[PDB]
């Protein structure tokens, strides 16, 4: 598939550099598994939130595209991370984006092919114009999940004055994909497990480590 | 905030970090499974597929695992790095991984589990682990995250940075250490879990800090010139 | 027994009498109640089969849940190793033919009477994996399922006869209980009590002489075609 030789503005990484995850991760819980029962109880316990102000921010963390997860950190971050305003940083995060989402994913998601929770149970998620798409992927593990949890990781070492509300708000969007019926909790599990395998995957790479350099200088100045 | 303890002002040698650079693991995790719960049956489940496993040898090496002290996880990662990692051999590394043990075991974990202080499932179940010499120290302890999974994926985490030839097998030895602590009883599998995300806040902030940074670099160098031998 | 059609009204269907059946109410334990752990399991069960229904095991599954009686014989033909028809083995398929009743009705009645057990697709309101036997069943009690028993009957006798390939026909009538969760129109414990009293009408039936007699016949019709 893609890598860093067929779209650089979303890699920094080839195929042989990225993570195993399918060698990585546990299967996922199979259904008559007790855990697949709490993957059921945390579904449900997650869709009588959508009609929150809880499920309303949900919904508009699973809006995202990538290039808007790193702007979705502004508020923890204690500033704006934009391509006007923080170019250096947004520039960094945007790069990243694909090795998370995809390569640190891709051998597992195909390997078990997992339904998703809306297409199990056959109802809507809470903003739909965002299924029709996902709908035929393998659920396990969550790309998203690890895209944001991986940029948490990264912008904490950016700013750690913030770490702790940085660090909760990354936690935080696994938890919407699981409010709003895009994964189950499992999936947001194991997503955060690949997301710090590929965050020191791209300590390793030159590229990355001069961007990084390059966004701490734009904060510190 | 964290509660009091060492950090890097009290020990140096075993700390990078001030009590107010940690991680608050209590306000980062969701509770421990409780008691009622589904969750709790499965934690249950796993402690008995893990007590099964003692007797194969799968229980050999989790038997093995759990007799390391701190100071010897370094040691364990050495077939999995390529090369041994010892004082001697490579004494940068060796410096770079005893000098953040208690960072990852100590301030990432510390505010969650004093404020749970979870029973481990040896003493909810009144019987020996599979290996009975670091017992009695542990037993009174608050299960939840576990510390040793912490060292133990952080140390992964930094030391595949250094040599991402071999991240699958260095990230494979740092989760099944975890898993060893399941197998053997001094956890439940919801401790190892949440150890494993507070280990990667914590190799995050160790980031953040000059003199790993400086020590990091140290290590990566002397690392590129032993693969000239 | 509760009532029903025996050998003496239908006997191209049956070679037992209402007398000569087994009380599977009084065999079988009761099926899971709502509440009950392994209730946990039966639904379990039908969700996993649910999500094979679009693999190639649940067309497989609708396939099989497409026979009528008439017709399960011939499901073996791949697996019995020769063709099982009237035209084939006439002889085999009056054997088959005839037991086919026995197994899927009088092993089952009075059990299938008294607990008159909802079947998945209605707790579920939801459609089978096949729409066209659905409007019939779904009124019966599901506990245990006539399928599956007639399904482990077949399985028996024919392994009887062929010994050679019993691991392949005892398989393909495991598996088609298994069709029945997976296409939803049994729980697992259904089909699980089916195959005891399957086993059970296996041997009811090995003291009947017209049966006796009818097997072998076709032991010898295919002695001959070997």
Not at 133 to 144: A, E, M, V, W
Not at 181 to 200: E, L, M
Request: aromatic share 8%; glycine share 8%; net charge neutral.
């Amino acid at each position: 598939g893609n890598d860093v030789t067929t779209k650089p503005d979303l890699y920094y990484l080839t195929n042989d550099n990225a993570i195993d995850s399918l060698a990585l991760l546990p299967p996922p819980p199979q259904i008559g598994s007790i855990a697949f029962l709490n993957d059921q109880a945390m579904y449900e316990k997650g869709r009588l939130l959508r009609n929150t102000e809880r499920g309303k921010l949900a919904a508009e963390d699973a809006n995202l595209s990538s290039g808007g997860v790193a702007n979705v950190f502004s508020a923890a971050f204690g500033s704006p991370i934009t391509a006007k305003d923080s170019p250096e940083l947004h520039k960094l995060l945007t790069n990243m984006i694909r090795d998370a989402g995809d390569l640190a994913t891709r051998s597992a998601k195909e390997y078990y092919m997992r339904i998703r929770p809306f297409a199990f149970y056959g109802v809507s998620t809470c903003n739909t114009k965002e299924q029709d798409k996902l709908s035929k992927n393998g659920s396990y593990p969550s790309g998203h999940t690890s895209i944001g949890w991986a940029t948490a990781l990264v912008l904490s070492e950016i700013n750690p004055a913030r770490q702790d509300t940085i660090l909760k708000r990354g936690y935080e969007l696994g938890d919407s994909r699981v409010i709003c019926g895009y994964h189950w909790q499992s999936d947001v599990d194991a997503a955060r497990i690949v997301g710090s395998a590929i965050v020191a995957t791209l300590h390793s790479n030159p590229v990355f480590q001069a961007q990084l350099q390059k966004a701490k200088d734009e904060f510190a100045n």
